[PDB]
Amino acid sequence: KTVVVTTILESPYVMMKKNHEMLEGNERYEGYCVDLAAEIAKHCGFKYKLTIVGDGKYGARDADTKIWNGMVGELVYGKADIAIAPLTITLVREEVIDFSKPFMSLGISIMIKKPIESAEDLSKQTEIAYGTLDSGSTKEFFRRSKIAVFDKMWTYMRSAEPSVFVRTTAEGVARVRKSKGKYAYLLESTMNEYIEQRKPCDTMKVGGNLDSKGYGIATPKGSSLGTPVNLAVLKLSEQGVLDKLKNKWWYDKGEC
Amino acid sequence: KTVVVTTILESPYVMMKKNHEMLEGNERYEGYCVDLAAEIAKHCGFKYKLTIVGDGKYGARDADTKIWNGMVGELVYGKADIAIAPLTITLVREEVIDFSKPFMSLGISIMIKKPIESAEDLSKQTEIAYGTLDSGSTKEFFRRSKIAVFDKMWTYMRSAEPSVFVRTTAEGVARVRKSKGKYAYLLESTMNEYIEQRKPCDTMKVGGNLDSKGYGIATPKGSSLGTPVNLAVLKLSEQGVLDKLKNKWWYDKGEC
Amino acid sequence: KTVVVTTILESPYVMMKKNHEMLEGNERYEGYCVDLAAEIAKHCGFKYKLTIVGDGKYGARDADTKIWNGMVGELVYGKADIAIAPLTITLVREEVIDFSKPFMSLGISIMIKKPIESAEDLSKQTEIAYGTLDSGSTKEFFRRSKIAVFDKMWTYMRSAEPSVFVRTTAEGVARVRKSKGKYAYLLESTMNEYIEQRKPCDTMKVGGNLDSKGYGIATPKGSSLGTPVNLAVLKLSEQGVLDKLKNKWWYDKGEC
Amino acid sequence: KTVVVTTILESPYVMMKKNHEMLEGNERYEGYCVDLAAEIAKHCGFKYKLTIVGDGKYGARDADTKIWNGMVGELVYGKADIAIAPLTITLVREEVIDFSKPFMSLGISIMIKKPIESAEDLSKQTEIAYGTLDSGSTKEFFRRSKIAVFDKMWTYMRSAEPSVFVRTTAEGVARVRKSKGKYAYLLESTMNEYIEQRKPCDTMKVGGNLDSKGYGIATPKGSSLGTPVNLAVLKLSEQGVLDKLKNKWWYDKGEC
Numbered sequence A, B, C, D: 001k002t003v004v005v006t007t008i009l010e011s012p013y014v015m016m017k018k019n020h021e022m023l024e025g026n027e028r029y030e031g032y033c034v035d036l037a038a039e040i041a042k043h044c045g046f047k048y049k050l051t052i053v054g055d056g057k058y059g060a061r062d063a064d065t066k067i068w069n070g071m072v073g074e075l076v077y078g079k080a081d082i083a084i085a086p087l088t089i090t091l092v093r094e095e096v097i098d099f100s101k102p103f104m105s106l107g108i109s110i111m112i113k114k115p116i117e118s119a120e121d122l123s124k125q126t127e128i129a130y131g132t133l134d135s136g137s138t139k140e141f142f143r144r145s146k147i148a149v150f151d152k153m154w155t156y157m158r159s160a161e162p163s164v165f166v167r168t169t170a171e172g173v174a175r176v177r178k179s180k181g182k183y184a185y186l187l188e189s190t191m192n193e194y195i196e197q198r199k200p201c202d203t204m205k206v207g208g209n210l211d212s213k214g215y216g217i218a219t220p221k222g223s224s225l226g227t228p229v230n231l232a233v234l235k236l237s238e239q240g241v242l243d244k245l246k247n248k249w250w251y252d253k254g255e256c
């Protein structure tokens, strides 16, 4: 029985190769998660077939219908056997499915054009604007935060004219690059570093992470792959394979 | 039934109260892990009794008898029901006990007397010597590595007179303090920050983490507390409780 | 019996004389290898007839027919009795023919348009591009190299836009000439010095050799000419004749 | 039938271990040639016993008795099976024994205290004196050199007061370190680099090599180990093991 691996199209995790039209099968894709899936299969000795999620969403439960969609929905309704992709380990997902130990740590970071070196410095001043998405984990973190620094950051953002929120990460990066140093973007650190290593190389990551999260390999609740997959993730972390894969797809392939 | 919690005496995770001679029970202890245990017990609704591990070790399997010691030994052999301590999540430990999601992210960092802002800056020069614990996870990581930067650092460390390795982390920090800027110490980032926030505040942490590890809450294999404890950690992480506890015992109670 | 010598037309080893139409026999050719053949024949006391290999190839085994071409194919299949040419001593060739002690030492060197003093200086910066041939020993050496410096050069070469690889060495030197100090070429040290000593004298050899190879006199396996030719090569090396011939065709006849 | 591997006590090729008195067998020694012998044994799958030559000589034929001594003598009279040591491939030795392809290329270089960057610069001036061994291969090379520059250097050395010749390499190095930049030493490039990478690190190698030589593994005339040993040497050269071994015992263990 071939293991159905559900993934998502996100760079540099899973992306189509340049000559993907000629190729077929698992050779159509490449990226960090493709190598991770290959290593996981090698450790556990199974045959897998990569599949891009049709919905194109990471996974959430609709309020009115209580129906999961995306990768989490595919795992819940038995449409896939494993999800090797940057899926964030959250409470509701852990309630509905199984997560392995995180294979990549991340957090909320600050993006500026290549004056600010910390979140506290951003909160103190008012010349430089900053914002997040109109909805998502980062905005929810800022809205609910009880720490004084993040509380005043959220108070400024909620009371900023014009609105500092952006509809998509691409819009935020574009505003950062077009604001000539008068706007800052708050986003995941992994995406921050990835964009930092892209042309035209005009953005940079400043300061530490405002919080801590992780990407975990997801397995259906009650499946037999959970323990071997978790052990494989720990083994890959301990031999440093995950460090090498991160360096390859972020800095070795960087264009800066 | 009262849940027995095994723990180790390590500042600031668990510290003995100043007036503990006249105190009894769980009121004798304080620290980050004590507050974490209180939060976990409140979430899961059980009564617990904090106990300190007899041998004062985190846990390892001897190559001679295949016998676990420390908190891992207490967990596998039925002595304790749960371990709430800075216990690193490792493959050999995960094969014998259940680890929850990490509640603290850490890594290998550089400690110097308070330029050099990265490990490659240390590697390039040789005027400033750097060292590692005599026998531990960090020394194992430096010896067993694939990146030639860390391989070069390890090669310099083994072929160096006098030996840069130190018996204990206390001896390493003492050497850093007495070396007036000539010697650097490599250790866990959490302990690095804790020492940085301690008197006489002559040390500082530079650069980022070389690797990525985590501290997890451990339960015996097949225990009924594994699932509720894992969900509690995720709940406390997303509400900022773990962030608040980290600041309270690292910065709010600092002496610098 | 006249000894058939197989050679390859390559400056300055074997070059065709200016008035070669009016000449016939061995008087048609001149170069370092012609003088070496004269010395070897004088030492071993035999008459020889210089011939140019038909396909103009040094020698390689076909991956599909296991058939040797070039001068190695000439020697193996009984066509020629000895090869006196810049034939690199390799493991695959030594299994099928006999190599004398090397008469020329060489290696991989850096050619730039005339700062950088070595290979690590090239590897560190990215302002100046560098690339090897599309195939050959240099590409394989950079591929298999486990050294950090050479591995990072190989990483830069494989992932580079536009492609730094070159179809032919003539196009490589042309690209170096036209690049006005922006592109560097990696090739054999002997050819590097030879091109340096030719007009318009706009190139220079910098740094030192990266690897170590050698050119040897080749003889069919199990032949009576092996040991006398090896002894002749050693005697000429210890008498300075090989040094004298190297200077004559590289510097005494240079155009710079 | 174990293989007797004769060798010489020369650094960094073969030297006694720091705690060699406690140890016994092949673990008693260490060095570049020890690792080379280990790799050669691994390639050919034989068991070997390292022995230091009693005479402490590399090998030469007496003028009167015409009896070889040293390592060459041990090989000739059947007292050893292979010589894995820095033995120079010369004409008389190749007439008497078998040599493999060189595993290390060396030459004559200039040693100065840390004004001169080549041999012609040394020949042009007269402020800095230069000398070689009172009796050795370098003095013989200079005595019968037909090149003009080496001829005038030999003329200067022959008619020089006080005499510039030395009785031992250590004496030459000491004279270089004592004459405060007013004396130059001509010696093998490998030894030059070795001394350059040792305390107190006051000498350096300048310019290129004046000639070309090589170190070869020696095998008795007519033995069956010659071809496999030669193939092993070529294989080690092509994979880069010889480069790695040289870098380890010269630069990775250097004290400068």
Ligand SMILES: NS(=O)(=O)c1cc2c(cc1Cl)N[C@H]([C@H]1C[C@H]3C=C[C@@H]1C3)NS2(=O)=O
Binding pocket: A101, A102, A103, A104, A105, A106, A214, A215, A234, A237, A240, A241, A242, A243, A246, B088, B089, B090, B102, B105, B212, B213, B214, B215
């Ligand atoms: N992608 S990375 O180099 O930053 C990275 C990140 C992480 C790694 C390993 C690597 Cl290489 N392992 C840890 C795991 C190891 C054990 C401790 C925490 C989890 C269980 N998770 S992590 O902190 O998310």
Ligand SMILES: NS(=O)(=O)c1cc2c(cc1Cl)N[C@H]([C@H]1C[C@H]3C=C[C@@H]1C3)NS2(=O)=O
Binding pocket: A089, A090, A102, A105, A106, A211, A212, A213, A214, A215, B101, B102, B103, B104, B105, B106, B213, B214, B215, B234, B237, B242, B243, B246
């Ligand atoms: N700021 S910190 O070091 O105290 C810290 C570190 C970490 C936290 C929470 C905090 Cl507060 N939670 C994460 C967990 C949450 C979910 C995503 C990764 C694991 C599962 N692990 S972590 O990245 O090791």
Ligand SMILES: NS(=O)(=O)c1cc2c(cc1Cl)N[C@H]([C@H]1C[C@H]3C=C[C@@H]1C3)NS2(=O)=O
Binding pocket: C101, C102, C103, C104, C105, C106, C214, C215, C234, C237, C241, C242, C243, C246, D088, D089, D090, D102, D105, D211, D212, D213, D214, D215
């Ligand atoms: N100066 S050069 O490149 O023309 C050159 C190069 C070399 C020469 C002689 C000369 Cl003149 N002889 C040596 C040979 C001599 C003895 C020692 C190594 C081989 C056997 N090979 S070499 O190191 O490849």
Ligand SMILES: NS(=O)(=O)c1cc2c(cc1Cl)N[C@H]([C@H]1C[C@H]3C=C[C@@H]1C3)NS2(=O)=O
Binding pocket: C088, C089, C090, C102, C105, C211, C212, C213, C214, C215, D101, D102, D103, D104, D105, D106, D214, D215, D234, D237, D241, D242, D243, D244, D246
């Ligand atoms: N860099 S080094 O001195 O350790 C070194 C020197 C030499 C090496 C390999 C190395 Cl790593 N191989 C060559 C050999 C390979 C083939 C060509 C010449 C001989 C046969 N001899 S060498 O030119 O004497």
Ligand SMILES: NCc1cc2[nH]c(=O)c(=O)[nH]c2cc1[N+](=O)[O-]
Binding pocket: A010, A058, A059, A086, A087, A088, A089, A169, A188, A191
């Ligand atoms: N791979 C980055 C990334 C990862 C995500 N993982 C999730 O589980 C999620 O719900 N949303 C995400 C958004 C992004 N994003 O577009 O920045």
Ligand SMILES: NCc1cc2[nH]c(=O)c(=O)[nH]c2cc1[N+](=O)[O-]
Binding pocket: B010, B058, B059, B086, B087, B088, B137, B169, B188, B190, B191
């Ligand atoms: N930082 C607390 C700490 C926690 C540890 N947990 C472990 O599982 C371990 O094997 N070694 C540790 C060392 C330390 N230490 O003293 O730095």
Ligand SMILES: NCc1cc2[nH]c(=O)c(=O)[nH]c2cc1[N+](=O)[O-]
Binding pocket: C010, C058, C059, C086, C087, C088, C169, C187, C188, C191
């Ligand atoms: N004469 C130099 C030279 C010699 C070579 N000998 C070979 O056996 C070979 O396979 N390729 C070569 C390429 C070159 N070259 O053009 O750099």
Ligand SMILES: NCc1cc2[nH]c(=O)c(=O)[nH]c2cc1[N+](=O)[O-]
Binding pocket: D010, D058, D059, D086, D087, D088, D089, D169, D188, D190, D191
């Ligand atoms: N450098 C090693 C070294 C190797 C040598 N090999 C020889 O075959 C030799 O006749 N004399 C040598 C002298 C030395 N030396 O002491 O410099």
